[PDB]
Design a protein around this nucleic acid. Structure first.
Ligand code: MG
Length: 580
DNA sequence: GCCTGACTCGA
DNA sequence: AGCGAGTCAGGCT
């Protein structure tokens, strides 16, 4: 049963109504400088398909797209906005984004096309994109009749689904979360992606040359120590050398076979000289393949920039993710890897990189939501939280805290921030499960409010079916009742952790919105480039650094008011590396 | 060519 | 017996 629509070959007035569902279709996964294959508009007047070479060369249509007062409902409006930015056209007036709506209503559904969103309200008069475009090698744009019908069906679904999504959002007290937070952030993210980050490719390449030379030396050493050649990158072949030829002890197994993970190899190093060489090889080879060759592959030779895509609709927490490239895991802990960040430079001469990061935002949120007196006091005094945690769990004074005590308290703190289990903690600290449970018990005696929060939030998840964040983001936890221990225990941890990590996410998202408004109010040229969970990275003219030193931390600090202060550290320099 | 497992990087 | 992302090897259709 085909859906009625006009396959127009000129733009008409009735296509430019002030409320419409709009589809601006970009089929390439990476939408930067990507083709727009077709356009559909559904409004009070009717349903329309337009060919993009017609529509996007039409002054009236382009004006309509750019007119804030002409309201549009879309799915994944950031994809469309960015593709249009590459063509010199602004998209404004997007007042409803179905992707973001579906994501807020239930992030566990994994909604990534109109059809998956529509199915949530029993609407099935639209096909999945995968059924129309194909997948992998077979992926293709079909002939115009099939394409046009698909785009009009997606637009009609958007038109029909706006009301029931907005109604459920409102029942959930999430309507302002959509309208005041996620949608405005989606525009800000679109600008960041489009701007991109400049890369000194010449420095990356010379780095790669040194690494290649280093890898070759260590690789030869390994063959000599093994007395043969083999694929060092294959955990199977490496397993045969280590555990069969060299008869090293098997300390841990993986579902497939013998574990060759870094932590197992650390413990084998005293038996054989090969082990340290393998570890060195794995460190260098990760830098080379993931961070030098991987970045070079996605730099546009055209501008020497990388344009990441932020997935705002993926995580259970509310966190953002970053792809092509992933700019959220650039090395920093070890000096050799950290030098990679010397390759990320300002895009204009006499500009600098500015970076501002929250200090312990997750634990500060926990203090706030648990109202734990001791944790709150510690933050109100701006104490070193790991030293203070050590003093309390070991019952020592400050000057009796040894480096090992601090490291282990830091690990407990880490476990709380990321919701890891007693098994996780034990793995992390290389201790027994029993000792790890002892650590946790000690922590709860020092922080009874945290313990009480942890009990209460698990009960609330059981009673309501879900937990919520500070700004009303929601996670459903149906596994909370399960009779499988490991399935149930995971859900309980997610009940504990999601209000911590998801509230941190909420705050930094609001800070991004507040900051973009302030930058414009202050007439600064400073621009946001990246977000990395608890940190914001900007670039600006050197003449703006002193003002940004005062402005950026203040905006981030004041994004919300909690029972404890928020605290923001900042740095700036010639490269991302130097903004430390 | 497509999928999966093993490994490792960040916050 | 955390999460996402990317790389690599090795296995099947
Ligand atoms: Mg920090």
């Amino acid at each position: 049963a085909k859906m009625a629509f006009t396959l127009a070959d000129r733009v008409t007035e009735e296509m430019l109504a002030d409320k419409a569902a709009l589809v601006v279709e970009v089929v390439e996964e990476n939408y930067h400088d990507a083709p727009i294959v077709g356009i559909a508009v559904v409004n009070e007047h009717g349903r329309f398909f337009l060919r993009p070479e017609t529509a996007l060369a039409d002054p009236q249509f382009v004006a309509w797209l750019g007119d804030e007062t002409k309201k549009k409902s879309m799915f994944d409006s950031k994809r469309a906005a960015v593709a249009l930015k590459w063509k010199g056209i602004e998209l404004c007036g997007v007042s409803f984004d179905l992707l973001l709506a579906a994501y807020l209503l239930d992030p566990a559904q994994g909604v990534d096309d109109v059809a998956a969103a529509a199915k949530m309200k029993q609407y099935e008069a639209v096909r999945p994109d995968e059924a129309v475009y194909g997948k992998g090698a077979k992926r293709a744009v079909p002939d115009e009749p099939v394409l046009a019908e698909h785009l009009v069906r997606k637009a009609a679904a958007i038109w029909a689904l706006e009301r029931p999504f907005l109604d459920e959002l409102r029942r959930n007290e999430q309507d302002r979360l959509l309208v005041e937070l996620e949608q405005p952030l989606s525009s800000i993210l679109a600008e960041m992606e489009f701007a991109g980050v400049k890369v000194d490719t010449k420095r990356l390449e010379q780095m790669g040359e040194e690494l290649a030379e280093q890898l070759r030396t260590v690789e030869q050493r390994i063959y000599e120590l093994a007395g043969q050649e083999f694929n060092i990158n294959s955990p199977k072949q490496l397993g045969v050398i280590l555990f069969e030829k060299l008869q090293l002890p098997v300390l841990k197994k993986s579902k497939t076979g013998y574990s060759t993970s870094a932590d197992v190899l650390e413990k084998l190093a005293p038996y054989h000289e090969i082990v340290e060489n393998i570890l060195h090889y794995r460190q260098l080879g990760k830098l080379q393949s993931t961070y030098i060759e991987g970045l070079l592959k996605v730099v546009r030779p055209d501008t020497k920039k990388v344009h990441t895509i932020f997935n705002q609709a993926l995580t259970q927490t509310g966190r953002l993710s970053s792809t092509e490239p992933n700019l959220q895991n650039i090395p920093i802990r070890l000096e050799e890897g950290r030098k990679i960040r010397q390759a990320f430079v300002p895009s204009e001469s006499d500009w600098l990189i500015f970076a501002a990061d929250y200090s312990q935002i997750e634990l500060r949120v926990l203090a706030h939501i648990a109202e734990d007196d001791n944790l709150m006091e510690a933050f109100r005094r701006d104490l070193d939280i790991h030293t203070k945690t050590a003093m309390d769990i070991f019952q020592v004074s400050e000057d009796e805290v040894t480096p090992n005590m601090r490291r282990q308290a830091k690990a407990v703190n880490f476990g709380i921030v990321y919701g890891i289990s007693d098994y996780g903690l034990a793995q992390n600290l290389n201790i027994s499960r029993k000792e790890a449970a002892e650590f946790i018990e000690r922590y709860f005696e020092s922080f009874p409010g945290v313990k009480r929060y942890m009990e209460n939030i698990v009960q609330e998840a059981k009673q309501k079916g879900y937990v919520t964040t500070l700004l009303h983001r929601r996670r459903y936890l149906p596994d909370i009742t399960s009779r499988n221990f490991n399935v149930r225990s995971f859900a309980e941890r997610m009940a504990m952790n999601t209000p911590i990590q998801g509230s941190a996410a909420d705050i930094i998202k609001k800070a991004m919105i507040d900051l973009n408004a302030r930058l414009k109010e202050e007439r600064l040229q400073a621009r946001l480039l990246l977000q990395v969970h608890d940190e914001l990275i900007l670039e600006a003219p050197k003449e703006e650094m002193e003002r940004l030193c005062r402005l950026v931390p203040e905006v981030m600090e004041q994004a919300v008011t909690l029972r404890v202060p928020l605290k923001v550290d900042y740095h700036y320099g010639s490269t991302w590396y130097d903004a430390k």
